[model samples]
Target: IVDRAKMEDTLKRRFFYDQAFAIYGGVSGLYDFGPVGCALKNNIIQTWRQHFIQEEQILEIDCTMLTPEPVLKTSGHVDKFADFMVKDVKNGECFRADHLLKAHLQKLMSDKKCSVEKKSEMESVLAQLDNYGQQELADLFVNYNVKSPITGNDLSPPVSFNLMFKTFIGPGGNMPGYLRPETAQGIFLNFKRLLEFNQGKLPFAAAQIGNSFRNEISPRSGLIRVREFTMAEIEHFVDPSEKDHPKFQNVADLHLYLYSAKAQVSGQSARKMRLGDAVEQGVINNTVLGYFIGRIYLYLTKVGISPDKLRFRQHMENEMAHYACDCWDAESKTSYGWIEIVGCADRSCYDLSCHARATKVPLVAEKPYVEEVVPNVIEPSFGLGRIMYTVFEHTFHVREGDEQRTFFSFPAVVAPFKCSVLPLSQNQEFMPFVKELSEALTRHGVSHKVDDSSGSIGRRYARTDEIGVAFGVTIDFDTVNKTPHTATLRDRDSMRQIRAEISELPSIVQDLANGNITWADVEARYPLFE
Candidate 1:
């Protein structure tokens, strides 16, 4: 099990992230990233852009977060995007109905006194929890003897509450809109413009990375559930007849843990299978969807998420939107259980058709006088906050012999700083070496820090490790008195030190940060520093 208390302490203490507006007692589901947190977040975004957008040549666009009501209405957010909630009769405390039922049944399932029959029944209900409507949930509430979790008071029947943060457009009460609940709708609204920009191409994708708002009834789990979070969404429009992708071969051999609907129904666990096989056997809907799932797997694992703890779970028919042909969620196992970090779906001409019907603008890829052909969209949407939190959980480790020594083993690409430059002591002689090293690193565009604070070299190293600096460069007495100006380089995870000339330090660190070489390679090239 992960040491959540120690990890949270390190994160908050080091200003990775904290509750927003803490001086005013703070609000739930809101957070502010500090220096280290902000830098790390930007790095993650940059990597995401490079991995998906730049690599695929996707058209990236920015849209207004304040979306108009008509736009969302056509997209079905006004009517269907909501959560069922029940409130206590006495204290009027609110809770999501499905969550409440799930929690109550989970507590019962864990009871030593529960019968196997009851356990089976509850398991069935839990699997289809999202399929229930208001009446169905209310019935379950009474049948399962559910009550308010906080006060044990009786609860009212479930009611649907929209998750969008509603607002008026341009200070006019007559015009109703909302902070968009998801970013895909904005891309959907601009389909015609994007289609023109792509010169009417049939298989072009448009991506957006921006903030989304969800006015959750009860938000918990720190960054896991938040009021406002960043989303990176890609909508790849393709002809319904042509769902095959050219890059399928590149990821066909990738093995992934797949929790298919059949497996879930049969009470079997997720099994490892080749992505190509999954697609070939029709487990995954089409080649394009399979290709994206493979790419997402590579991206998540490359950024340091454990491949073993990551699985692609298929959405059950009842759990998916009516218009979606198939959908899969990339779930990461964190301390909070398996959290969905990405969603890949084959939305068969749903959004564009809905918009076309509502706005009378034939949103089609190929339009002929006799026949108009609408394109089916394959979308890959990512929750940036969930991914960030999971990365922390997966990468966090406490030293074996020292409980006080903790650090995040973030990969160099996403680490807040590539490395740290520390002076052995505040010796006047060490200043020039430190300056030279910092400038060398700067010239090579490697992010680093100079820690000259009052502390032992070990203390300083620990500080750098806590912030997840991948490598460390120390200017010591050996460097000040020795010819050719050599210093020690340290790897964060292994805590191994190597001696190399100061002039060669920048290129070495740059290679490490860019993932062009391994720590083993660096050690092989340089002499070990005891």
Candidate 2:
């Protein structure tokens, strides 16, 4: 139901976001959020900050994007932070080898509906794809006889590809570094300072919202996968002895669409499981992991994402990073498939132990932190672009059998403008009330636009609704006819109108702007247009 081409045009028309270099032919996988889109994204940013930063008292930081090569080398990125890729033998066209093998083989098998014996043979190879090294994956290309999806040509053998963007810090090209591939390592590098900042608390978290870059062999699906993106990461340090969180009980009863490893390996479906029940039953490893998992659920739904299409998927053993103890992804089921927006990893003290040895912190202190013994890390990584991709996809609505009648159904708090005030005509009579009402909303901290254009009232309303303007107030002869004045308020989704007292406008608009009140609340108190 979500059409990318139409969504692109609508967002562009409303100045939400689009390909950055649109004037030219345009670059791939990079976008510039326009004014409306940027403003709304800031709301998403603020909302997320409230859920993770302000509510929980997280220590937030902004680290330099340019990271030294040595830091990554120690972190295993300079070596293992890589993907396997293969090139077309003649054309030199690069493809992510593992992904290619999996996708092509799965498609081929599904089309053929191979015999049970053959299906079992292929499924066995697919299940262990992650465990394969370059040599093993290379053999699969030869064994399965995989070829280029683009040209159907013979492909080169698999090889390691480091995706970091390398650059010289200074003039002579002496300093070797990269644009950070992730936000976690910056938090790790600042652990000592952050620990001291938190007054050496036993369990505390550090948060960062910043940009990270990656070079993908293939970047498609618009915002689902991008070369440059804004990411939010939380690094919570807890004692391995006890990883319980104080707020664990607060979200314990929250129900989530959980696909546990037990369910996944058994080929069963996700079920509605309480965060507490999942942990207690050992489907989720610990209280700390379950707590963050539930927190992610709380945040996503609060941002207007449809709950039915979101699920928490447990990563099977080989699917997770080699160093991770347990991992889960908050995946949104969208047109693009189940895309991961957040990844929660239980990294049992690997980075902290490395930092301890290199920085001369007591090796014992390392045990207290990132450790097999002393400290454990609970990391929740967010992909903002991918998250926003799903947010729009989920919010988009078009009248049944009418794709052209498209509009966004975002909640008021998440939209660019909570209200749009329209002066019914160019008639000078409407000007006085329009200015005063708009000024009143401004004083109440409401983001609203005064539409005084010469367009017909119906046209103006349609224009606002398309950009997801949540509410509209019209000033016309009706306001001039009333003793106390009145304006018909239009609800975007229902397209219903209600009449309210102008004297009570300030209170009504403010509450409505913040989404503290709903249309049902409005309809309950106010008289419907006669």
Candidate 3:
């Protein structure tokens, strides 16, 4: 368990993020990032770009957000992108029926005074909740004797509410459009061109990082149930006969905590397994899908999210598309419960096939002698804000048990500022040295900041640490005169100090920032402070 209030308080104090429309009476789901927040957000996205786009040699594309009706019509968002919602019969207030039912059951199970049979009955229904339809949810309301929190009155029958925000294009009022709900479709729309760009290759991947929107019924869970969010999505097209990956061996040894369908149906929790073993057992469905699941696990851990709080959950039968072969989500545990941050699905030719059939365009690839390939699509979609929120929660801890001071133990790679440089005191003597060092750090393409505020050295360090500056460099009288050309570096987690030659500090910082060096390595060579 984590301190949700403390985490949120520190985030706001550090100017990380705040409600977007604060002056206009505020919005529940929207938020605006301040300087620190912007830096952290960009750092996270850049890390994602490196892991997926640079490492895999995937094609990166930016598509239009204002999408036409025909595109979504063929994608099935026209009639099917919806939620099971019920109205409070008295106040006409709307609530997502599935969410409401699950939340209520969960609360009952959490009660210390609840009866065992009551808990057992509620738990089974929730375990089977995702597989239920609108009518099934409606029946659950009456069966369980559920009532609206607003009025304690019976709810109306559940109905499907499409969340897409529809609008007209070009003032014509005839051509309906929508803000896209997922980034995958934009990549799908460019299918033929991407195929040509790949020289008609059977297996290639395209990636996009963009915004998506949904008209949420009631988005009260901060970033978890937001109306607008940033998404990092990939569309990997491959041969229909081939579901395996060429580099599957690379991640075969990787371990994952999998909440499989068999386990969930059996009422068991997630269990750890090696990716290759899961593939061999036919547990993950195919090699390529398992490869991405492993890759996502690595990416999340690398960016400072705790591996213990991260697990890959296999989708149930009714939760995925009828045409898709398999689906899995990289879910992270937070105050909002286990939330899906990344979804990897083996969407077998459904997207390209639908677009081809609708537009009469040949969205197929060909080889020298092989038949034309209506490629199967493997997609890994990410929610940026959910991951961001999870990272913040997982990395936060109190410096002392009483919690007067706290810090985010962010990995240097994704920390907003790689490190912070500061004068040891409010003295003019260290200004020139601090200025020179800050500029040198900037020249190396390093993200850093200089603090010359009128605070004690420890207090300034605390300020920096709270915002997750990975390391702190202190410029002191010893560096300027007494010890001549030497400064102290403080590690964020250990609070240990080591002294380095001023001349060698830049290269040392660069190496340390990129994980090429560590405190252990530095301690073995550098001089130290008590």
- Which structure among the candidates has the greatest lDDT? 1
Q: Write the per-residue lDDT of candidate 3 for residues 218-322, one digit (tens) a residue.
A: 788876788888999999998888877898888889887999988988999888999999988888888898788888888999988888899998878887754
Reference-based lDDT, residue 114, model 3:
92
* Stretch of 10 with least lDDT, candidate 2: 363-372
Q: Estimate the TM-score for candidate 1.
A: 0.97
Give lDDT tens digits, candidate 1, residues 1-530. 68888898889999999999999999999999999999988888889999999999999889999988899888888888888998889986889887999999999999999999999889988877877877888899999989988769998888998888988987659888999988888888889899988888678999999999999888877889999999999999988878899899999999999999889788778889999999888888788998999999998888878999899998887778655768999999988788899999888988899989998888887733645578899999998888888889999988665447998899998999898998776767988889889999999999899987678887888888998889999889989998988998999988889999988999999998888998999889889987
Error in Å for residue 139 of model 2? 3.4
Error of 1 at 458 (Å): 0.8
Ranking by TM-score: 1, 3, 2
**lDDT by residue (tens digit), candidate 2, 297-327:** 8888877778999999877776676457789
Task: Provide the overall lDDT of each model, using Cα atoms, as 2-decimal numbers.
Answer: 0.88, 0.81, 0.85
Q: Give Cα distance to truth, residue 41, candidate 3, Å.
A: 0.7
TM-scores of the models, in the order given: 0.97, 0.92, 0.96
Off by over 4 Å in 3: 112-114, 321-323, 401-403, 425-428
